[PDB]
C-alpha cells in the first residue's frame, strides 16, 4: 500500500520535505535528546501518543540498520564494497531515520501545531531564491 | 535507551520469544494480508490505533530495507559480497519485521488480548514433552 | 467502470483470494447444494436478498456459458479447436462462477458476516507455516 | 432449477420478449450509459437496489464473455473457427446481456413501474400486423 | 493529486464524455459566446461564480496555447513538425477546451441542473436505436 | 475580452508584476506544496472558493501543457525543433503558471489581504535603490 508515515500526525511527506539535509541534526543527537528528554515515557509500557509510538518504532528501526552495519562489518568482504554499503546505511538511510525522528520528537516538545506552523513558514522562507530570501532562516520555537 | 517493540502492546520481546522463529509466516503474506484487511486504515489520515500506528510504521521499515536491498544489488560490484548483504537484508532483518507485522496484524485481526492469550496458549504447546503435545498446535481464530 | 463482484456484500475479490482456486467445490456441487437449499427461494418471485439476486444471476450466468458451451461443441468442426474452447468455458470461466456460487450460497448459508470471518479464519491457516499449520483447515459450518 | 432473471423485479421473459433484436442498443453502449449515469452507484459498497445489484453482476458476466472472446482469440486456431466462437460471443449471447443491461439500466432510470408499463404497451404495438399498426412504435419516457 | 475540473460543479469528464465528441460547437464559436453574454461579467472585478472564474481562467488557459502555437510556427522551420504542434494544439486539446467552455457557457446560460440533465437525456437519446426514440434529439432551453 | 486572471481576487496581473519574476518559485515545488495542503479540497467536489476553484483549474492548464509536451517530444521527428517546443511550454507558458500557483497557493495559505499588502510591500523594498534596499526583505510567514 502506500503509507505516508505523515498523514497519522496531519503532516505529508511532501510538505516535510522542505527541510533540507543540513538542517536535522545527528542521528546521534536525534536519538540523545529523544533519550534526553521522552526515555522514560518511551521505555514505559504506556503508549503515550500516536507520536510517542511512532518514535520508539523508529528509534527502533534505526537500530536494525546499524546492526545491518555493523554486520556487514565482520562479515562483508572486499573492504571497498562493504563499505559502499555501510555508507548507504550510514547516510541515505540516516538521512530519512534523522526526519522521522525529528518530526517526531519535535512535536512531542513543541507540538503538531506549532511543528507543522513551522515548516509551513520553512517552507515559504526555503522556497525563495536568495535574491529575496531574508537572510536568517526560520527557527522553530515554543511561542 | 531499550525501548521494547512490544511492551506498550502488553507483551513483551520476551513472551513473543514463546513463538518459534519458523513460525512467522511470510513477509509477503504478511503484507499481502495487511493490505488485504486494512489497506484502508492504513491509509487513512488518523491513527486508528497504536496498532495501526506501529503496523504502518514497521510496514514502512520493512520497506526501507527493501530499498537498501536493492541499491545495494545494483550497486555492489562483486557478486560475491553484493549477495551476502541482499540475503541478511531479506531475511534475518526479515524474521525481525515478521515478528512485528504478525503481532500486530494478528491483534488488529483478533485483539491484543485475545493475541496475547494465544501466545501464553502456545508456550504450552510447543513446551509440551512430544510424548503428550497435541497433533494440532494451537491457532488463532476469530 | 470496475465493478467488484464482492463490495457491496462486504469483502472483495482480494479478500476472497485468501481461499486457493482449487478449494471451490464443483460447479455441480454448487448448483446441486443451491437447488437443494434455495430452489425455492431462488424460485420465488421476490429477492430474497441481494445475495439471492446475485446467486440468481450467477446461476444464470453459468447457464449461458453451458449454452455457449454445447453450440460450440455442435457448431465448430474442428474438434482440435471446438474441444479448445469447450474447455476453457468449461473450466476457467468454471473457476470463477464457482467462486461466485460458493461465496453467495455459502453465506446464505451460515451468514455474510460468518463467511467473512471464515475466510480471514482461513487465510491463517493457509497462511500458517507447515511446520505448524494444524491437520484440518479451518471449515464452515452452521 | 428454472430461474427467471425477470420475476424478483415483476416482470417475466415472456414479457420482457416481445422487445426485437433491433430495439437494444449497443453492449459498449449500455455499459456506457451504465457508466455513464450509475457508476459510482455501481461501483460503491452500498447493495444500491434488488436493480443495482443485478446489473452488476450482469455488466460482469459480459465481461467474462469478452475474455472468453479474447482468449478464443489467442489461442483458437483455425481462423473460421475460433470466428465461429468470437461471433456466437459477441452476438447471440451478445443480444441477451443487452436485453438485461436494458431492462435494469431503464427501470434504473424511469421506473419498474414506468418500465413495465411501457413493456406492456409497446407489446401490443410490436404484437400488431403492421396493416393496423400505428406508424411509429412506442418510446420509453418518464412521463 | 487527481483533479477534475468538472467535479465541482457536479458533472465529470467521464460525463461530458457522454456527448460525442464532434457535438461540442467551435472554440471560437464558444469564444465568441462568452463574450456576447458574458465578456462584461468575465471581466468584471467580482467572481460572479464558480462558473465564471472557472470560465475566466479556461478562456486564459485557451490562449496561452494559441500563443505556444504562434510562437511555434513562428519560430519552427521543420513546418511538418511545426505543424504537427500547431495542430495538435489546434485539436486534441481545443476539443478539451471546447467541452469546457461548453459545460460552462451553457450551465451560465440554462443552468447545471438542466446542463446535467441535458447531458444524459441526449447522451441516451444520441444512443438510441433511432425506431424507438423521440422523433428530434433534445436540446437547451430556459 | 481583456481578461485580467488577477481582478477578481483584488489584484492585478500589473500588480504581481511588483515581484520580479525570477522569484517565483518551481512549478514542481508550488504543485508539491499545493498538494502538501489543499489536494484534499482540491480534489473534493465542493467549490472551495474562487482561489481553490481558479486553483485548481490552473494546477491543470499546466498539465496540459506538461502533456502537449510529451506528446511533442514524442511526435516531432526534427528534435532540434522538438527541443525548442519542449521548451518554450516547460519553461516560458510554465513562469505564467508559477505566478497564478504562488498567487493562489500563497492566499490560501496566508490571505487575499495578507497577500495583497504583501505586494505593496515587497514592492516598495524592491523598487527601492540598493543602496538602500535593507537586509531582510518582506515575506510571509508566522512570527
Same mark, same amino acid.
Given at each position: 500500500?502506500?503509507?505516508? /508515515?505523515?498523514?497519522?500526525?496531519?503532516?505529508? &511527506?511532501? %510538505?516535510l520535505?522542505? $527541510?533540507?539535509?543540513d538542517?536535522?541534526?545527528?542521528?546521534?543527537?536525534? %536519538?540523545?535528546?529523544? +533519550?534526553a528528554?521522552?526515555?522514560?515515557? =518511551?521505555?514505559?509500557?504506556?503508549?503515550? +501518543?500516536?507520536?510517542?509510538?511512532?518514535?520508539?518504532?523508529?528509534? $527502533?528501526?534505526?537500530?536494525? =540498520?546499524?546492526? $545491518?552495519?555493523?554486520?556487514?562489518?565482520?562479515? $562483508?568482504?572486499?573492504?571497498?564494497? *562493504?563499505?559502499? &554499503?555501510?555508507?548507504?546505511?550510514?547516510?541515505?538511510?540516516?538521512?530519512?531515520?534523522?526526519?522521522? =525522528?525529528?518530526?517526531?520528537? +519535535?512535536?512531542?516538545?513543541?507540538?503538531?501545531?506549532? &511543528?507543522?506552523?513551522?515548516?509551513?513558514?520553512?517552507?515559504?522562507?526555503? *522556497?525563495?531564491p536568495?535574491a529575496?530570501? /531574508?537572510?536568517n532562516? /526560520?527557527? =522553530?520555537?515554543?511561542?
Open positions: 500500500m502506500d503509507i505516508d /508515515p505523515y498523514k497519522e500526525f496531519g503532516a505529508t &511527506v511532501e %510538505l520535505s522542505f $527541510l533540507p539535509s538542517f536535522f541534526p545527528s542521528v546521534r543527537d536525534l %536519538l540523545d535528546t529523544a +533519550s528528554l521522552y526515555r522514560e515515557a =518511551l521505555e514505559s509500557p504506556e503508549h503515550c +501518543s500516536p507520536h510517542h509510538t511512532a518514535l520508539r518504532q523508529a528509534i $527502533l528501526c534505526w537500530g536494525e =540498520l546499524m546492526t $545491518l552495519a555493523t554486520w556487514v562489518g565482520n562479515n $562483508l568482504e572486499d573492504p571497498a564494497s *562493504r563499505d559502499l &554499503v555501510v555508507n548507504y546505511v550510514n547516510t541515505n538511510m540516516g538521512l530519512k531515520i534523522r526526519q522521522l =525522528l525529528w518530526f517526531h520528537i +519535535s512535536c512531542l516538545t513543541f507540538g503538531r501545531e506549532t &511543528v507543522l506552523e513551522y515548516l509551513v513558514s520553512f517552507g515559504v522562507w526555503i *522556497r525563495t536568495p529575496y530570501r /531574508p537572510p532562516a /526560520p527557527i =522553530l520555537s515554543t511561542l
